[PDB]
Amino acid sequence: SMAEMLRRDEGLRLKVYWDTEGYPTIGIGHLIMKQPVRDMAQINKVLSKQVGREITGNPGSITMEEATTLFERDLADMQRDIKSHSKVGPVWQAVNRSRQMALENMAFQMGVGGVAKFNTMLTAMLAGDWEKAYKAGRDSLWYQQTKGRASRVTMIILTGNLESYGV
Amino acid sequence: GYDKDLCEWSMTADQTEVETQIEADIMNIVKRDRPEMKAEVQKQLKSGGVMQYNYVLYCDKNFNNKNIIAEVVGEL
Ligand SMILES: [Cl-]
């Protein structure tokens, strides 16, 4: 499942932390605000609307059930966007569920708009040229900067299965 | 790996304390198993983040922490 896959790649927090860009984050890679804000009154105010009840704490905390609910909504939002995207969508519709997961994993990390920048990789996937698609994914700055995750994800694109995640 | 105390602590404690523990645990395995990979691992932790490894290291009985090097830098 995407839950198991992204729990592995994103980790699991019940208290706010800040990502590599300085953005407040919680749960399974749930971005609270795309701003380098540390003020906990403001972070908790936004997170309260996202979770649906008043968040408290410095930093704010959620329960495990809330983290799962945020993830399910984040996953659904990303899946909505990837399927309707004029460049990524056609590729997602043309590959098997495992390779769909790889694309969804990337979109969860970088946004569907980030995935759309992988022109060579996407073109190769539409052609079934998996070695070319794999090499294009591994030639990227994304691979340079999150190499372990990019390795596991591009291995899916190459092999068409999830064994790089132990499945 | 699964560690009852570190699992929940890593989910809830202040980020700075948790990242110090994660980074120390990773770097200890690197030094034992693939010491030449220290600079590559440090580079990946800076560019890619540290916090995300809390789940596989402390919350997942099915993940063997000897594999955390490949988790950070990729297979082989
Ligand atoms: Cl070990």
Numbering used by the authors:
A (entry chain A): 175 to 341
B (entry chain C): 23 to 98
From the paper:
One of the T4 early gene products produced immediately following the genome injection is gp61.3, also known as Spackle. Spackle, along with another T4 gene product Imm, confers the infected host E. coli with resistance against secondary phage infections—a phenomenon known as “superinfection exclusion”. Our results show that T4 Spackle forms a stoichiometric complex with the lysozyme domain of gp5 and potently inhibits its enzymatic activity, whereas Spackle does not appreciably inhibit the cytoplasmic T4 lysozyme (endolysin, gpe) responsible for cell lysis at the final step of the phage lytic cycle. Crystal structure of the Spackle–gp5 complex shows that the binding of Spackle induces an allosteric conformational change in the gp5 lysozyme active site and partially blocks its oligosaccharide-binding cleft.
To that end, we co-crystallized Spackle and gp5 lysozyme and determined the crystal structure of the complex by molecular replacement phasing. Two crystal forms were obtained, in monoclinic and orthorhombic lattice systems, for which the structures were refined to 1.78 and 1.92 Å resolution, respectively. The monoclinic crystal contained two Spackle–gp5 lysozyme complexes in the asymmetric unit, whereas the orthorhombic crystal contained one complex in the asymmetric unit. In addition, we observed several 4-(2-hydroxyethyl)-1-piperazineethanesulfonic acid (HEPES) molecules bound on the lysozyme surface, including one occupying the oligosaccharide-binding cleft (C-site)20 and another in the peptide-binding groove in the monoclinic crystal structure. The protein structures of the three crystallographically independent complexes were essentially identical to each other, with pairwise backbone room mean square deviations within 0.5 Å. Spackle engages a highly positively charged horseshoe-shaped surface around the deep substrate-binding cleft, spanning both the N and C-terminal lobes of lysozyme. For instance, the main chains of Trp192 and Leu186 from gp5 lysozyme make bidentate hydrogen bonds with the side chain carboxamide moieties of Gln37 and Asn76 from Spackle, respectively; the main-chain carbonyl groups of Ser32, Met33, Thr34, and Ala35 from Spackle at the C-terminus of α1 helix accept a cluster of hydrogen bonds from gp5 lysozyme. Although Spackle binds over and partially blocks a distal site (E/F-site)21 in the substrate-binding cleft of lysozyme, it does not block the enzyme active site or interact directly with the catalytic residues (Glu184 and Asp193). Superposition of Spackle and gp5 lysozyme structures in the complex with their respective unbound state structures shows conformational changes for both proteins upon binding. The conformational change displaces the lysozyme catalytic residues (Glu184 and Asp193), both of which are in the N-terminal lobe, with respect to the oligosaccharide-binding sites.
